[PDB]
Amino acid sequence: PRPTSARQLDGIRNIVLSNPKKRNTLSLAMLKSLQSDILHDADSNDLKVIIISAEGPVFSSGHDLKELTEEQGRDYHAEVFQTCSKVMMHIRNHPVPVIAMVNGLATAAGCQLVASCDIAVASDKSSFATPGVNVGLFCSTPGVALARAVPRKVALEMLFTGEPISAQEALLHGLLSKVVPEAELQEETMRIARKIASLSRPVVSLGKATFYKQLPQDLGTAYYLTSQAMVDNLALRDGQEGITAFLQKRKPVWSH
Template sequence: MNFITKTSSLQKLITPNLYRFYSSKHNLTKSSLENGVQTITMSDTKGRNTLSVAMLEELTNRIKQHESEQALRAIIITAEGPVFSAGHNMRELLPEAGREQHKLVFNNCELLMMSIVESPVPVIARVDGVAAAAGCQLVAQCDMAVCTDVSKFSTPGANFGIFCSTPGIPIARSVKKMTALRMLFTGLPISAQEAKECGLVSVVCSKEDIDTELLKITSAIIQKSRSVIELGKRFYYKQIRYDIREAYDLGSTVMVDNINLKDGQEGIKSFVEKRKANWSHSFK
């Protein structure tokens, strides 16, 4: 079966390249789209940017907000204040909230995490501060993460009688076992440098340099074909579920599909002809 699914979403063009910065109805997040990069900002500083049901729903909606627009090339998730996110809102997990409420919290959390995986463009966490429990999960689930050298990461759920089982899912897929289990069993935080060394974050830098580092990454992404990046992202998350032989079998098919895309052909021709590629960003 052809790995590439033709969709109309990547064939839509939008005229404006800049959206006004605006807040949601709950004032928990803000979003802007400029020069191909959507920045989603958690702005519940009073609540330490906890991932309440409302916050989870808003973040999911923000991630999906422009996904069908060809102008969108990357998403950055960041936060106001010294706490990126303190994790779930514990009031929503009190016994009196009831089992159905508890299910609602974790179902919405799953929807958010999967919206990151299923987004057609790279999703990057921008962390300047503390990312704890489900906040750490959010960082680990992003495709990349850039953090300042003062940032800290932890999964302290066991301290409060709730093991960080769901945060452990993306952490186990990003972080070396010894570090992942130390975080999950002890609840002790790790530093930004430790997070870099164990694979939780991509880049560590100073506060002054974080936006420069993000610009370097997003600029590199924007220079590529959106359809090729989408194909590659979907294949990456698919192939890690298979053993190596099955992954290679699937990968060979995907490479052939990629080469026969309009942008695959354009990329090869531009390389041979030593010129800049003119991408269509489509799945034709």
């Protein structure tokens, strides 16, 4: 048995949360299975892009609340939230783009995981909430990723009232990149995944890292940083292949 299942094919790794009976709860065990599937062979050139999806009608309900009862000890509580944050940080610092594919409810740390991904596609019936407050545990952790996804006015009404937002509201305020009918979720997600897998890994990997490095900077420093990265991109073989191909009106053949 294992709470995530993973499969990689034509550069696309799909990590499926596979405990629908437990509403794909981010138990310490599930988090570690997830961490493991994300890190596995992360620098292989054969890996181009990660999709994180879920089995069933709940993407994830968040943490296992039994693990956060008094008797488990504060050290164990610390471990749950730290392992979780470590995973969000792995995703952010990963060499490849990570995409959330959502087809139903993501709540609390489940909503955190969607928000932490580079891209997020959902079906129109999905919904997102941070309701820890209803069980006496403010979604503070989730609030980190939600604060960087949506406006404060949206985030604080989510966090203080525990009420969920629709997929269309998520799309409007920045939590998601795309929304489509359920029937098309897989075609739409694979459209983005395949496009990514069809590009140069080292160009896309430098693109991602650079983007998160410049993001918190002032404008001048953000531009020093990125300019210098364009110049480095140009010195890659795939950089010159890409330009040459364009100038010669033909398809680029990436070596990575």
